[PDB]
Structures are given as structure tokens and as C-alpha cells.
């Protein structure tokens, strides 16, 4: 019965909107739910030179891209939370659901 939903997004408050939506769903459908486990954030860091050519004073850009991850566990059959997980899909957040 141990279904696991992994919510992954670049935006935090859009991730927290979908996360707080699925817990509201699990609780209003009377299901055992492990709260959202905040897995450590990953910082995709690339540092470039700023100039296209060579002859400017040595200046560097520092581009970052944070990626955030929650996972919520559920003790329930597949098709109930399938109807819940189909509800409230945002353009930003990315969902992956495993069964066992």
C-alpha cells in the first residue's frame, strides 16, 4: 500500500502550494500520510567569464539554479490518490509517483 509521490520544482512557494494541496487531499479522503520530507536542495552552479573577448579586466559571472525536492508517502490503494494527484497540476512543479 506504500505509494510515494516525489514533488520537484525550481520555485519553492509553487512547490509548497502543490505539497500543501496533496496533504489537504489525503486528509479529506481519510488516508495515512507521512508529512513532506524536505530532501536537501541542489545548487546547479556555473561560473563564466563576463567578456566575449579576452581584453577586459578579469570579471566572472556566478550563475546559480536551485532545485527543491519534497516526497510524501501514503498507505492507500492506487486509484483514490490517482484522482487527487490528477487535481491541481501547476506548470512549475514536477510529480513522479511509485507504488511499492
Amino acid at each position: 500500500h506504500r505509494i510515494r509521490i516525489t514533488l520537484t520544482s525550481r520555485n519553492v512557494k509553487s512547490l509548497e502550494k502543490v505539497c500543501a494541496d496533496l496533504i489537504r487531499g489525503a486528509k479529506e479522503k481519510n488516508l495515512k500520510v507521512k508529512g513532506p520530507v524536505r530532501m536537501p536542495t541542489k545548487t546547479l552552479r556555473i561560473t563564466t567569464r563576463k567578456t566575449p573577448c579576452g581584453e577586459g579586466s578579469k570579471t566572472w559571472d556566478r550563475f546559480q539554479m536551485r532545485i527543491h525536492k519534497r516526497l510524501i508517502d501514503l498507505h492507500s490503494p492506487s486509484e483514490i490518490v490517482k484522482q487527487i494527484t490528477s487535481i491541481s497540476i501547476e506548470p512549475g512543479v514536477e510529480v513522479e509517483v511509485t507504488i511499492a
Binding site: 520537484t8 525550481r10 541542489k42 546547479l44 532545485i67 525536492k69
Partner: peptide
Amino acid sequence: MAVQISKKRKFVADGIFKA
């Protein structure tokens, strides 16, 4: 699926697709 790209490489691939 079988190739099974990492979240880092997947999200950059999603970004380059838009670019």
C-alpha cells in the same frame, strides 16, 4: 525510463528545450 537522466541534467534539458 531506461536512459534515466538525473534531476540536474533533466531540468537543464527542460530549460534548453525552451531556449
